Design a protein around this ligand. Structure first.
Ligand SMILES: [Mg+2]
Ligand SMILES: [Mg+2]
Ligand SMILES: [Mg+2]
Ligand SMILES: [Mg+2]
Ligand SMILES: [Mg+2]
Ligand SMILES: [Mg+2]
Ligand SMILES: [Mg+2]
Ligand SMILES: [Mg+2]
Ligand SMILES: [Mg+2]
Ligand SMILES: [Mg+2]
Ligand SMILES: [Mg+2]
Ligand SMILES: [Mg+2]
Ligand SMILES: [Mg+2]
Ligand SMILES: [Mg+2]
Ligand SMILES: [Mg+2]
Ligand SMILES: [Mg+2]
Lengths: 100, 56, 271, 129, 65, 88
RNA sequence: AAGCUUGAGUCUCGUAGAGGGGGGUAGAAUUCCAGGUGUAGCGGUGAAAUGCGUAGAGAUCUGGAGGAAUACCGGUGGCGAAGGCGGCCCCCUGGACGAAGACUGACGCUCAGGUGCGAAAGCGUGGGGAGCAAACAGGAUUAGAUACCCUGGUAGUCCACGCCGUAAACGAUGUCGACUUGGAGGUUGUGCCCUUGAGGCGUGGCUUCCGGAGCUAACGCGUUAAGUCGACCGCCUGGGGA
RNA sequence: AAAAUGUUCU
């Protein structure tokens, strides 16, 4: 059960939905008996360049200890969802609980 | 090489600064490099030559 | 797989058989069969309207579900089957309510896989949702042109349609020809590419095979006399006129679309 | 791989001679030890020490007469890829008897002269000059 | 003078843009190791981090948009 | 390459005592297991040539080990092959 | 026949890496399309012309489509058996190296025939096709110009699965092993040390440069040898013919 | 930008 440093940025108008989404993700992770070692909502940050066609995006750092299938599912969801703009699942050695 | 003239500053000086910035970037040089296609082999050879030169 | 036949006879030499062992080796689901008699390319007036059609082999029409109305009810695929009436294979699917329907088999789909139609349905090959719900970028097939009508685009062996944009109430489809086409976003579209893509690699190998399919020999204009076809006559092999149909219309390049009703929907013509 | 130990030893000795090494060490062997002993007897090295129980290291102390090597040359004649066995009559002599041929014989490893005296020969292990 | 080594870090963080954007020039280009005096391994890691940032749009690829 | 737990299990199966990890038989088993694991991958990924090279090497090593076993003691080898379902 | 642990492997924990395969995506740029702004050039070269342009080009902004390649990092830097491998992310995956220790116990090395991989071009079927570009065309240049320059421009380059099986596929240096003075680096481990500070002292792996002995026809090579030896294979016997 | 060649044997 490897670790995953996920960082995804959500469309700034959909900021009200973001917490719910996060919760859902957490549930999913736990559904297949995995941990969520940190979860930092950075909020609406100024982008260095405009992704899609907007200048601010609502960032969500989230670190996981989960299986592969769940991660795949998450990725799929991200792909589907127009709310999220960019995601970045990363593999990470260690639990990396500390704050950024 | 983005520049902007600050309050109370000559034109010439600004221009010079811009030029310096450009040089630092390596924009003109880069452009030159990309004017024509160099074969990877050729590039490698060039690199080697440069390395040799550096060994003074 | 594709199977190049050994040349034990001339006629068998050039044959490439698109074999597909997952297809059901048996009689198809009888309720969904209906009679489909051959025409010979002949209308109510008895006249050969379309040439080079006839003989063939007796076929039973498979009532293939192109509309996909069973919303919410998931369906397991029982078996892929051979449909003689199309280049695609047809998956027989068992909906949990009890109903069995044929669908165009998608690419990845096979026996045991689940499919689903409607708005709630998940994005995975074989599932059918309105193109408002399907994401931009997706390769889809069995696309409806009017909502509720039935899938009319991308039904052939290995075809699909890229959903390329969604400008309001219309999605833009990059059709398999290259024709960019506005279709209403309410129109359904089955996720995935229709799955028999090796179909095109099959080579009949002989005239007989063509005949079996229902394709009577095509005599070339130039082979005929002037009375029958514009490219007619000439002592020896002459052909001193511009390629035309049997009815005199130019055949190399002359565009024959003159719709105007649907030019609104055509974003960019194929090329 | 280490497909000739004696040869390797010889090479090491030669290299030591070349480079002015006071001593030359290697993995010891019974045959090797015998060879060393023979060399000592004949005059080309000072002393050999077989130091160790599980892994014994043969450590030869090389000679340097007048600032140059005593071992002028040291070639393996017999070698794994082509063995050389000489009868008593056939037995070689290195530099017309101003240098030795270490020969392995039914009665021990010894210089060629010794073998001749005995009335036997065998595997001419190495010419040492 | 390599800073990362001094610090005693296992890996450079893409999220730590404040550190990274000292090692990228004004135009957005990744600054050389020879100039900054970074260790080679660290430099590679740093570069990777920068790339990640760019992808996520914390740092810019170039100074145009 | 091979999961630690799996390796341990293999060792337990084949090696006489838990630390007996170099035992020819154990090694063979490890190789065999690894090969099996890789087979699926190779089926999936036919053109992964570099990876296949490693696999080939492993196979060769296994064969060598088997050969070594055979001459030292045939019965053991016979047993081992039966256990593994190695063709020969 | 019995052994032993130095060779050769296995396991423990880490390590760096453009190693390979599969799949996602990112931004810059070129091209094309649509639309706006605007007006006589643009483009090109040695200079020209062909070409594109008053039907509105080029320039300039906006939106889109696509394909290919991944600036900077980038380094006689790294990894890979060689070929080669370069954005980032994931999944599968091979090797290498180190740290100690534990285990096997010569299981090794080399290898004709054989098998596999093997750049680029090329070929086969199906896709794709922006840029580049054999062929081809026109313009130049020219004495001629079947070229170099320019403008275009198809196959090809891209992908999928096959075939091809060769290159100055080179380090023009077969593989494995041992040994022999040094220096300057690079890279990547690791043990020790008041890290009193970026350091100090080692010990390994891989690697560039100089250079000693020695070798060499000299050039050079020179602890990664072309030195000193050993094992195995490959190949050579004047040039042309070939 | 453009600059081709040099009869044989001594
Ligand atoms: Mg017809
Ligand atoms: Mg025909
Ligand atoms: Mg005909
Ligand atoms: Mg006739
Ligand atoms: Mg007529
Ligand atoms: Mg005629
Ligand atoms: Mg690995
Ligand atoms: Mg023992
Ligand atoms: Mg090619
Ligand atoms: Mg050209
Ligand atoms: Mg021409
Ligand atoms: Mg091709
Ligand atoms: Mg050759
Ligand atoms: Mg080279
Ligand atoms: Mg050669
Ligand atoms: Mg040198």
């Amino acid at each position: 059960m490897r670790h995953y440093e996920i960082v995804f940025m959500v469309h700034p108008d959909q900021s009200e939905q973001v917490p719910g989404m996060i919760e859902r993700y957490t549930a999913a992770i736990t559904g297949a008996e995995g941990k969520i070692h940190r979860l930092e909502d950075w909020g609406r940050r100024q982008l260095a360049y405009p992704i899609n066609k907007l200048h601010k995006a609502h960032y969500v750092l989230m670190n996981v200890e989960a299986p592969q299938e769940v991660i795949d599912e998450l990725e799929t969801t991200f792909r589907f969802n127009d709310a999220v703009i960019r995601s970045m699942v990363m593999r990470t050695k260690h639990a990396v609980t500390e704050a950024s | 090489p983005v520049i902007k003239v600050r309050e109370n500053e000559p034109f010439d000086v600004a221009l010079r600064r811009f030029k310096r910035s450009c040089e630092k970037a390596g924009v003109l040089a880069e452009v030159r490099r990309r004017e024509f296609y160099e074969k990877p082999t050729t590039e490698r050879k060039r690199a080697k030559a440069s390395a040799v030169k550096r060994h003074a | 797989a594709v199977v190049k036949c050994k040349p034990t006879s001339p006629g068998r030499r050039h044959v490439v058989k698109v074999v597909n062992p997952e297809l059901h080796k048996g009689k198809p689901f009888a309720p969904l069969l209906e009679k489909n008699s051959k025409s010979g390319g002949r209308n109510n007036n008895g006249r050969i309207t379309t040439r080079h059609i006839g003989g063939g082999h007796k076929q039973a029409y498979r009532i293939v579900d192109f509309k996909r109305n069973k919303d919410g009810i998931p369906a397991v695929v029982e078996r892929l089957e051979y449909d003689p009436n199309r280049s695609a294979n047809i998956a027989l699917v068992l909906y949990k309510d009890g109903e069995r329907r044929y669908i165009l088999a998608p690419k990845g789909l096979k026996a045991g896989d689940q499919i689903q139609s409607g708005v709630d349905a998940a994005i995975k090959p074989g599932n059918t949702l309105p193109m408002r719900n399907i994401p931009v970028g997706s390769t889809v097939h069995n696309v409806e042109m009017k909502p509720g009508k039935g899938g009319q685009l991308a039904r052939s062996a290995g075809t699909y349609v890229q959903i390329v944009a969604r400008d309001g109430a219309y999605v833009t489809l990059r059709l398999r020809s290259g024709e960019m086409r506005k279709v209403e976003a309410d129109c359904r579209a089955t996720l995935g590419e229709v799955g028999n893509a090796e179909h095109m690699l099959r080579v009949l190998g002989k005239a007989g095979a063509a005949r079996w399919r229902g394709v009577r020999p095509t005599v070339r204009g130039t082979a005929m006399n002037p009375v029958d076809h514009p490219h007619g006559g000439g002592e020896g092999r002459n052909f001193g006129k511009h390629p035309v149909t049997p009815w005199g219309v130019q055949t190399k390049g002359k565009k024959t679309r003159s719709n105007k009703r649907t030019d609104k929907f055509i974003v960019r013509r194929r090329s | 791989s280490m497909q000739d130990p004696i040869a390797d030893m010889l090479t090491r000795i030669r290299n030591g001679q070349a480079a002015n090494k006071a001593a030359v060490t290697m993995p010891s062997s019974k045959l090797k030890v015998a060879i060393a002993n023979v060399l000592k007897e004949e005059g080309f090295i000072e002393d050999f020490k077989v130091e160790g129980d599980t892994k014994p290291e043969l450590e030869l102390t090389l000679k340097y007469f007048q600032g140059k090597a005593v071992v002028e040359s040291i070639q393996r004649v017999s070698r794994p890829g082509l063995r050389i066995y000489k009868r008593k009559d056939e037995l070689p002599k290195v530099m017309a008897g101003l240098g030795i041929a270490v020969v392995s014989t039914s009665k021990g490893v010894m210089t060629d002269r010794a073998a001749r005296q005995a009335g036997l020969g065998g595997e001419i292990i190495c010419y040492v000059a | 003078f390599c800073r990362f080594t001094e610090e005693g870090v296992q890996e450079i963080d893409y999220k730590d843009i404040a550190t990274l954007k000292n090692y990228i020039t004004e135009s957005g280009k990744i600054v050389p190791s020879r100039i900054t005096g970074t260790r080679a391994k660290y430099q590679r890691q740093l570069a990777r981090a920068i790339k990640r940032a760019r992808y996520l749009s914390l740092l810019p690829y170039t100074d145009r948009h | 390459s091979l999961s630690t737990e799996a390796t341990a299990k293999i060792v337990s199966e084949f090696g006489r005592d838990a630390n007996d990890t170099g035992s020819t038989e154990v090694q063979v088993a490890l190789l065999t297991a690894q090969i099996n694991h890789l087979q699926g991958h190779f089926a999936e990924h036919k053109k992964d040539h570099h990876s296949r090279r490693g696999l080939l090497r492993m196979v060769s090593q296994r064969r060598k080990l088997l050969d070594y076993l055979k001459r030292k003691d045939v019965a053991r080898y016979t047993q081992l092959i039966e256990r593994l379902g190695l063709r020969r």
